[PDB]
Structures are given as structure tokens and as C-alpha cells.
Design a protein around this ligand. Sequence first.
Ligand SMILES: [K+]
Ligand SMILES: [K+]
Ligand SMILES: [Mg+2]
Ligand SMILES: [Mg+2]
Lengths: 201, 201
Amino acid sequence: SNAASGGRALRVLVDMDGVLADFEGGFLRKFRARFPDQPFIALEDRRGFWVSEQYGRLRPGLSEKAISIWESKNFFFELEPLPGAVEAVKEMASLQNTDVFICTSPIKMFKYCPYEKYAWVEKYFGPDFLEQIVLTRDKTVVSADLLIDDRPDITGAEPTPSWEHVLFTACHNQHLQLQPPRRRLHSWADDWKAILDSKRP
Amino acid sequence: SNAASGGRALRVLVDMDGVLADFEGGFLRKFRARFPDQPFIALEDRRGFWVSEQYGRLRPGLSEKAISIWESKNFFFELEPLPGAVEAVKEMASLQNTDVFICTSPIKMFKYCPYEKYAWVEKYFGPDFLEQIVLTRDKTVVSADLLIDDRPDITGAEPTPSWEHVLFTACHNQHLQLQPPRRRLHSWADDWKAILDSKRP
Ligand SMILES: [K+]
Ligand SMILES: [K+]
Ligand SMILES: [Mg+2]
Ligand SMILES: [Mg+2]
């Protein structure tokens, strides 16, 4: 909930793919269904942020096939929420002196992805939550106290972002050793309120 | 053009509707075409940011008719650029130590507007410029040195935005007296480089 007039709420950016929406599982399911005769990467064997790069090393032309899954209509809209995500973000947004924004990067092909991300937020959070969406390829130019995001390397035009990046665990990042004092949120069952509270006055 | 590694470019947020794209003229044309038997507001007589509010005072039900124009498919995509806008932003983006982002708010109905704004940027600036789009209802959480925007009142969750808001003249704001030291960019023919340079080190 917003701070009282001109006052200062804790601001939390919550990433979408890999934090709210199960991109990795949705991708794998639809890849295997569309391309049943191709090899695939089990989630436990995922390494590195870019799915298409790992697929492209697996077999010639597989990068392009992988891309064709997330460029397809309904890919983003049909993603399942991660366990606990919707419930946690609803709770978070209801907290005193706490403003939550969903900060998400679209893919390069824009026919469906922006639209379906708005539709997905409406679906799980309601029409009023649409006001909290920030769609951007560069998250460093969005100011906040925290960014909860599964991407390990979050860079852009601002060399010194205002947020602390807390790495949300995903299959592709779970083995990564981070430079102290970087930290993780391991799942939505993990203690996200303690992380928020550590940044409060 | 981006600064050299870890260095600091001037950052400019350029608004879309009313600064790059002629929303007011496109609206009026399509309103008169669809609703030829209704009264309308000539651009010279436009007052206040919200078109639908002025229309709703003109005649019962006209707010809803007005809204139906910008909720329609192709409304955003077909907007004409303002004179000099595309050329100025291309030049601006090519300047040393200058990063340009297009910072735009979608309407509430999201079926077409996000998509068509991306398509419009691709059209006039090319595919690589899509990386510079930030879609948000709250511009105060986007950090920059400048925000060039026709909306007089730009508020949100951040009580002290990092940018200076320079008001871009539009029909609906041209008579407004601003509190010193607020300033204007009167059109793209006006001296936008001097405004940028005033914020440089
Ligand atoms: K990071
Ligand atoms: K303002
Ligand atoms: Mg993510
Ligand atoms: Mg505008």
C-alpha cells in the first residue's frame, strides 16, 4: 500500500518470467509437444539464462526451433504461476509502506508478448494491478529498493542502479555462486518478508 | 550513444503521445469520421489533459464515444508523427553521452495499445530502437536527467523523481502558466539541444 502523502514507501520490483510465471516449464512442455523427435534439455540440466543458446549447442537449428515456441501466440498467456507467487505478491502489495511493481522485459518479437503479459497480470491480480506493470528491456533505469529477478546479470544504461538485486532461484541459476554480499530468494516459500524488512528505515 | 564502460551518459525520457505521436489530431479526425453528427472540440479549444472529460462535459455519453476511438484497433498505430519529432529523436540518440528512452503510458484497454506502440516505434525508428521503450503508468519510478512530456501533472509512487520535467507544448496545455522554474519545449523546432546541454556536467 502507498505511503501517506509525499511520504516514502519501500519499493519492490518483482520480475515476471521465472519469478511469477513458469517460463522454463511452459517452454519445455510446449517444445516437447511441438518437436517430439528433437532432443531437449531437462530443467535440472538447464544452465545459463538464454534457453536458445543451450539448445543451439545441443543440435544445429534447435535455437530457432526453441525461439519459435516463445514467439507463438498464447505462450506467455498460458504460463502457469510459480508456487506461492501470486499469493506472496498479493500479500506484499497489501503491506503498509510497500509499493510493488511488476518489472518485465518483453522478447524481441512483439506481436503477442506485451499484450499477453498484461492479460496474464489481469488474470491473476485483477484489473487494478495493471497500473503496477513496467515493461522495459533495461531494468537499471527503474528506481526501487529491491529487484527480485532470476536473471544473474542485470545491466543497462544506469551503471549504479538504486535497487539491490536479489536473485530468485530458477533451474538455470541454482548452482551459481554469487559474489558476496549478493543474496537469493530461494522460492516464494522462503522468507521474502525478511528481505523486504532489511531494506526498511 | 551510450557512455564508455561504467561511465555516465545524460539520460532523456521522451514521451510518446503528444510529443512523438499526434494523438490529439488523430483522435479528432477519427472522432469526426465515426460520429459526424456529434459536436466536437477543435484543437484550439482543448483544455485539460483528459480528452474524455472535456467531451463528457460537452454532451451526455460523449465521454464513452471518445474513449471508443482510442480503444479501437489501429488508433495508435496510425498516429502521425509530430513535425520534427522523428528527426530530433534520431539526432538526439546519436549524440555523444546521451541515452534516449521512449517512456509511454498505455491506456487501460490493453488489447491493441501496447502492441501498436511497439509497432509504431519500429516503423519510425527501426527494430534496434525497440530496446529503448519503457511502457509504464508511473513515470516517476523511471530515473533520468530529463522527461520531455506534454502532461502537466506527472506524479506517482516516487515523490522526488530524478528527472526534470520539461513540458512539451500541446493544444491542451499551451495556455498553462507553470510555476517557476518549470520550463517548456515549445515544439521540436525549438532548441532541445540547449535544454539537454543545460543538464550536462
Ligand atoms: K545483477
Ligand atoms: K510535473
Ligand atoms: Mg526473469
Ligand atoms: Mg503525452
